Amino acid sequence: GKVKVGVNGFGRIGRLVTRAAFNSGKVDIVAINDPFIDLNYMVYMFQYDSTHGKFHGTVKAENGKLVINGNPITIFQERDPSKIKWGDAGAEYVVESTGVFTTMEKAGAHLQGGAKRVIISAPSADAPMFVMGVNHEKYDNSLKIISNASCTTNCLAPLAKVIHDNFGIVEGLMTTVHAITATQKTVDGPSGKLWRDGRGALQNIIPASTGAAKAVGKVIPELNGKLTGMAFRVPTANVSVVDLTCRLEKPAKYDDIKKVVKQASEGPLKGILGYTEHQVVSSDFNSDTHSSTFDAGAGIALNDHFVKLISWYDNEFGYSNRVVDLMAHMASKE
Amino acid sequence: GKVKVGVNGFGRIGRLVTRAAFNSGKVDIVAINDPFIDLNYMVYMFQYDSTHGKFHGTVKAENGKLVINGNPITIFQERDPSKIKWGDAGAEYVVESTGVFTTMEKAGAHLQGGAKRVIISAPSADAPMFVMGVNHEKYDNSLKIISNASCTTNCLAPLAKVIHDNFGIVEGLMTTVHAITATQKTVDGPSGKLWRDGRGALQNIIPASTGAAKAVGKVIPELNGKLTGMAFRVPTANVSVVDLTCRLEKPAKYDDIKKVVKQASEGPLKGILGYTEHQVVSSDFNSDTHSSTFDAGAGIALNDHFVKLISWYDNEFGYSNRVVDLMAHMASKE
Amino acid sequence: GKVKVGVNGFGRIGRLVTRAAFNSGKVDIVAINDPFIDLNYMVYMFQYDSTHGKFHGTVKAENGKLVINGNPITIFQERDPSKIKWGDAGAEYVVESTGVFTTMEKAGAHLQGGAKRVIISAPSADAPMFVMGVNHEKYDNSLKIISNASCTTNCLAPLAKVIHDNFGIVEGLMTTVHAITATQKTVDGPSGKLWRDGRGALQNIIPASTGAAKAVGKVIPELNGKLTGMAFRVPTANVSVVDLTCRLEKPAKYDDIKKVVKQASEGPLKGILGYTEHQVVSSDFNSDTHSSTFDAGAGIALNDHFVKLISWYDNEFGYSNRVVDLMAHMASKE
Amino acid sequence: GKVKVGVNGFGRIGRLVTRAAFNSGKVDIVAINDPFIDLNYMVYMFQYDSTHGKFHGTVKAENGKLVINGNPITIFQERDPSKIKWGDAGAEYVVESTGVFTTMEKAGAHLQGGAKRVIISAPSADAPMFVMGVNHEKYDNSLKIISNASCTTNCLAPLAKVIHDNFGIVEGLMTTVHAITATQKTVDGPSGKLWRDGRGALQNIIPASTGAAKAVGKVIPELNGKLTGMAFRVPTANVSVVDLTCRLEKPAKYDDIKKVVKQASEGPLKGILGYTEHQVVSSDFNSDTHSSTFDAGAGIALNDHFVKLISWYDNEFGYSNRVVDLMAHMASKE
Incomplete structure (x- = not known):
């Protein structure tokens, strides 16, 4: 019963979050959004890393979808976060990692696209902050937009x-x-x-x-x-x-x-x-x-x-x- | 009878050209254009250099002008090269160093602003190329837009x-x-x-x-x-x-x-x-x-x-x- | 029927040869000689590497022997290569990797210690050179001291x-x-x-x-x-x-x-x-x-x-x- | 009435001390001792520096002496500090910069060679320490071996x-x-x-x-x-x-x-x-x-x-x- 995760932005944080999710297997990535990276460039970016080495697995492109370890991933190229169709892609949680939508109002545009909850991978001015192992027991399921700090x-x-x-x-x-x-x-x-x-x-x-x-x-x-x-x-x-x-x-x-x-x-x-x-x-x-x-x-x-x-x-x-x-x-x- | 030089762009090439012109004394810089750098940031950029060290001289800001070694320099913040008023600033030659206006038609917009000749500090597709000590005797004064190669x-x-x-x-x-x-x-x-x-x-x-x-x-x-x-x-x-x-x-x-x-x-x-x-x-x-x-x-x-x-x-x-x-x-x- | 290999010197080449031998499993390292590195410092050097990361396995020190993946390795601290007892350690081949014994006469001192053949991991003036995949079929078993080139x-x-x-x-x-x-x-x-x-x-x-x-x-x-x-x-x-x-x-x-x-x-x-x-x-x-x-x-x-x-x-x-x-x-x- | 200074060791500290002494002009270097650097290699080391650039002046070798800005410098290649003839070279003060003679007894061997006072360019266990601008007024001329700290x-x-x-x-x-x-x-x-x-x-x-x-x-x-x-x-x-x-x-x-x-x-x-x-x-x-x-x-x-x-x-x-x-x-x- 693993949750479905969409990732907004394919920068360093987004690629490393996708790599950690495929290495650990705790969640499933079903969608990636980036307006400036195409599919073959996404394959090239995910396959090769200067710091952490080559990806241990298979990554390729097929029918407009990014296939990692046999799992297909829908790719969006929308710029406006309210126009991304997270819902038909099946994504339940959305990781906001572009670094430009950090307030509650700006990161709440993902909820219009069909997402349930938004996790900001950056410090936030007004969203609640949670650090694993310190105060993560304070999460109470009625919060839609939270921040994982830095x-x-x-x-x-x-x-x-x-x-x-x-x-x-x-x-x-x-x-x-x-x-x-x-x-x-x-x-x-x-x-x-x-x-x-x-x-x-x-x-x-x-x-x-x-x-x-x-x-x-x-x-x-x-x-x-x-x-x-x-x-x-x-x-x-x-x-x-x-x-x-x-x-x-x-x-x-x-x-x-x-x-x-x-x-x-x-x-x-x-x-x-x-x-x-x-x-x-x-x-x-x-x-x-x-x-x-x-x-x-x-x-x-x-x-x-x-x-x-x-x-x-x-x-x-x-x-x-x-x-x-x-x-x-x-x-x-x- | 030194010529008056305007510089378009305050990147690495423009700052080093200004530094070489003030070190050698062969020409006089009278104007600098950059749309994204203000005056105090220009002072900070010209004064401190990680590679070539501190500037040997005095640089400051006075009455909206960049004063280097007692010489004032007019600052423009125009984006369109045809809208820069090179003529009333007294600039006769213009060094185009932004790296985005390299054709004859694109670099010829500086001639509308009152400039006489344009030197492109980049390789050009159709402008004539000159390298000092090799073919610089082929210059014949009837060329308005030339390129200094790389x-x-x-x-x-x-x-x-x-x-x-x-x-x-x-x-x-x-x-x-x-x-x-x-x-x-x-x-x-x-x-x-x-x-x-x-x-x-x-x-x-x-x-x-x-x-x-x-x-x-x-x-x-x-x-x-x-x-x-x-x-x-x-x-x-x-x-x-x-x-x-x-x-x-x-x-x-x-x-x-x-x-x-x-x-x-x-x-x-x-x-x-x-x-x-x-x-x-x-x-x-x-x-x-x-x-x-x-x-x-x-x-x-x-x-x-x-x-x-x-x-x-x-x-x-x-x-x-x-x-x-x-x-x-x-x-x-x- | 894997051969028994001794390594002379625990520099970069010797440690990487030991790491490759334990990763591939083609040969067995039974002895290491180094006069300036003790046993615990050998454990620290083999366990941690800045370039290739941590060793995938177990390495420790037990009863004066270096135990890697359950395999014990005899340690010598001799300086004179003719005084190293390769024979009672069971080593049949010896990899000379210190970079100072590259001639046939200097690297032939290991044969007095009981070694059968010596492989120099450096260019040699008079030993025959072999490169794998090019001229390695020219080896004829009657050569005792060869060089693997660089x-x-x-x-x-x-x-x-x-x-x-x-x-x-x-x-x-x-x-x-x-x-x-x-x-x-x-x-x-x-x-x-x-x-x-x-x-x-x-x-x-x-x-x-x-x-x-x-x-x-x-x-x-x-x-x-x-x-x-x-x-x-x-x-x-x-x-x-x-x-x-x-x-x-x-x-x-x-x-x-x-x-x-x-x-x-x-x-x-x-x-x-x-x-x-x-x-x-x-x-x-x-x-x-x-x-x-x-x-x-x-x-x-x-x-x-x-x-x-x-x-x-x-x-x-x-x-x-x-x-x-x-x-x-x-x-x-x- | 500038003092005559000998330098023991031509490492980084010794070369930079010689460079500072020739740049400032407060003291005069008359002798340099190093057992492992010859005269032409000393010329090459002093002329070229990766960090501080080329030396502003003239440096050459003449009649077995190192000539810097027209000033000749006697070169010694002794290993034992008690065997260096500082006295006939005219050196009054000696800068000990090799980093291996830091005690009073070890750095006092320079006094046998004719030197008057020894300054250690390193922390010392028993020599008095002086930092310029803090406690340098405590120097009282009856101390022969002092340390400049680090x-x-x-x-x-x-x-x-x-x-x-x-x-x-x-x-x-x-x-x-x-x-x-x-x-x-x-x-x-x-x-x-x-x-x-x-x-x-x-x-x-x-x-x-x-x-x-x-x-x-x-x-x-x-x-x-x-x-x-x-x-x-x-x-x-x-x-x-x-x-x-x-x-x-x-x-x-x-x-x-x-x-x-x-x-x-x-x-x-x-x-x-x-x-x-x-x-x-x-x-x-x-x-x-x-x-x-x-x-x-x-x-x-x-x-x-x-x-x-x-x-x-x-x-x-x-x-x-x-x-x-x-x-x-x-x-x-x-």
Whole structure:
């Protein structure tokens, strides 16, 4: 009884969500909409990936349909989201991943096309936010338009939940070293509002502002107004790292922090929060499906009330698998 | 009696042409047109460069004009080239560098605005092509719309001219290892016609097709139909290299080739064609104003009639300085 | 009846040969010698790889032995190759991969330790060279010390064999765009003999001299004295590309070249020489086991007697799998 | 009355110290010692630089001496530091930059050769540490062997001095995003003690441990035991950034922090501590001689008592110029 999923947009997030859905098998993709990509170019884009390698399976085109592993997928080329016929394609849930329809009113145009529920794979101004393993039990089936937050928020949340539940985070500041994305420029180029983001991504470090640490306070209501941070965008390909500097209410040695993080990663947060003690680097987490992996040896503690914790996350795969897991939990709640 | 130059477009080529014109002092920039860049963003773009460093001088904004080294520059934000008032700004020559007006009819819209002559900084389908030091004596002042060719053609033409004049190139094939440009994508992205150019520029090698070796036959009419080639776009920043494999009519040892190339680089082609015998690499030619520099130690000869020659070129600076030099020679011919 | 293989040196070639031997299952690794790597560091090196990802299997240390997939491996830390006890470890063949014992006299010290045959994974001055699929039928079991040539030679050989057999290569030059290796320097550093190789590998293009195209004439005796070339070392990670410019004796259109290369890649050279018509880039050949893959769309022909052909090769995996395949064919000939 | 300086070692630090000494003119280099670099290779190394470009001046070899700008330099090739004849070469101060003689006993071997004072360009276990602009007034001429600390400490010190003097740092944590160095490996390689440092520098992020934040407490005695941190080594070329998260005793808005940092950068710490409000990136600080530049727009404050400050530093140039400035202040105190 798997749900039927349509995907709006065939960018990086849409292709990786389709790849995660075909790898895991939790949901079924039945429709893809993109106005600027044709069918053969869709075959070429899905088959070959510079970061995650070739697709393990068969992908081709037949009768105007995209056939992946023997499953045909209807292709739409509509630009207006209210004109996409999701209903006759059989799609029940719609993943909005273009990054330009993030409000409730803009993403609600998909409901006119026959879709039941819309999941935004981006931060939203007014839609409710859900992070898997932290507050996903708060979903109550009467919400039609929700938001899965972002990759950085998905990495920071579970981690901050365990530390807050065991030791009481008083205040903290986060820094993330982030890999390049699609919005950056190969060489110095014109960025309208963010002047730093228009500089050459290959040659530069590029400090940037982010709101994921503030969105943790939306995800965890007890931490509202206690977290903030910024980011650095370094010239790597896929893997990012989060560094959280926090002050604790209760005394906590580093071995106690390691023990409670390992215990959380084993039982309750299995598959969402990881734990390692090896001498790992960034490329050791390529195509890793965890939201965040705690690096025990990389962190440092100044005293019993002031620590800095290090975590890793694949901002492409882990996030797409969280979209699939959230969609599966949504389908189980009907 | 320096000519007055307007620049259409403030991309990489336009900014580097303005920088070369202010560094050399051969011409005077009096006007810049760009519809998507405002004045303060123009100040920020011209002041800071990731590749060539900070501008040696003063740049600011005063009374709606861009003041560089005390010289004010009028700024236009028109989109239609026929609506730009080049005449009241005092601009006599116009450098068309946007890359979208390359035909004679499209680039002739600048003549309606009061411009006298238009120089296209791109290959053109029907405008006459000129390369400095090779065929620039063929300019006869009755041509209004001409094309300066491209960086690769400017690198290949002087070396091919010297080798053909001394030994008689029978046929040849060229390969260029090229640095990234602006049209590439930081990560796998959607390229309409060129599917290979949409892949991630940081992770890939990306073979590509080019018409520069064919345009050498337009520049040198005796070599028509004797040259062709392709290119590779590797993840470096600025400097490219040309590798020419050719068959000669007359016997030629490698020392004779080195002698005639050095003698050409000293007297006739001084400043256009360089010569080195040191153990150089690509970053040794950053901000070098030569069109091409012959690497004596990097080439190899199989026999007396079959050689492979290696040359270096900064595809940003050398080319912009050639645009300025062509404009100066055009102004001297009036 | 698989042969027992010892590996001398745990560098990049030795680890990739061990990985290919455990992935394919054609031979059995029973011993590894390295004087500067201990057992736990060997576990860490074999488990984690930046280029080819994590090892698919189990690797650990037990009772002073390296246990991979339940198979224990004896570890030696001897420096003198004549003092390694290969015989009591059960090793019959020895892969010499340190890169410092390449002559027959230096690599013959392994025969004193009880080894039967020595395979050098490097070009050799006086040992016979063999390339799989080209001249591997010339092995006659009375040779104790042979050489498997190099990755570039393994890519160029089969390709040049097909073109020479079908159209008669008169003369040809080769250029290879090569990924960075271990001998390069992260930043400008001191290289004793090769001054260009001491420059910073991340920032530079670095022309270099190579002898693989000359070693093709040793592998194919009819092409002796007809091939030469050089190389460029660009800042990528794993995949290299070979560009061969040649003159043919018989007339050959490009479709005929494509047809004979595809026919060779299907029947006789299956698994050694590949063929593609897609719009591929370098990262599409990561962890590909082919020696060379012909890129049909990337090449160009000037006329019927002067062509340039493009081929891809993973210089790490394909070469190690060729070492394993040569060892298996050697074991079958006893 | 400039002092005579000998340099031990011609690595990155030694060459950049020689370049800074010839650019600034504060001291005179009279001797260079290196056992593995000959004279012509020294000419090649000093003339060409991938990061900072070609040397602005003349460098050649004459009569066994290295002639830079008409100044001859004696060359030694001794390995034992006690066997170098610094005295007959006229050298009064000696910069120990090889990185292997950092204790007082090991670096005191240069005093047997006729040197007066030894400056170690590295952190030292028992030699006194001095940072220019912070505690350089504590030098008292009776010390023979001192240490100039490290680049990270030189960036963090002045900044922490101003914040501690104006607002009273209670405790703080530091993270630095550092460019690749010489100790890293182009590809996965064998690192004896630091297993993470042996991984491929081009592909990885590589968390690492550092002691510069602890050495600030040696430089500023009131901050002893209040600072600690770690580092990340990203694949860029030259410029690093320091990220300091601290808790303040007195209330401080961000505008007050900006005001006191700008006032410190103008008057007392001119040339040592910089200040900017532009939208800068890392390559804007290439060849910048400041120890640290405060980025006003990149930092963030959670409340009045918990801030995160961002600063930039060229870890190659700024540090070498600090070595020259410390040597000049040492020479003025005689």
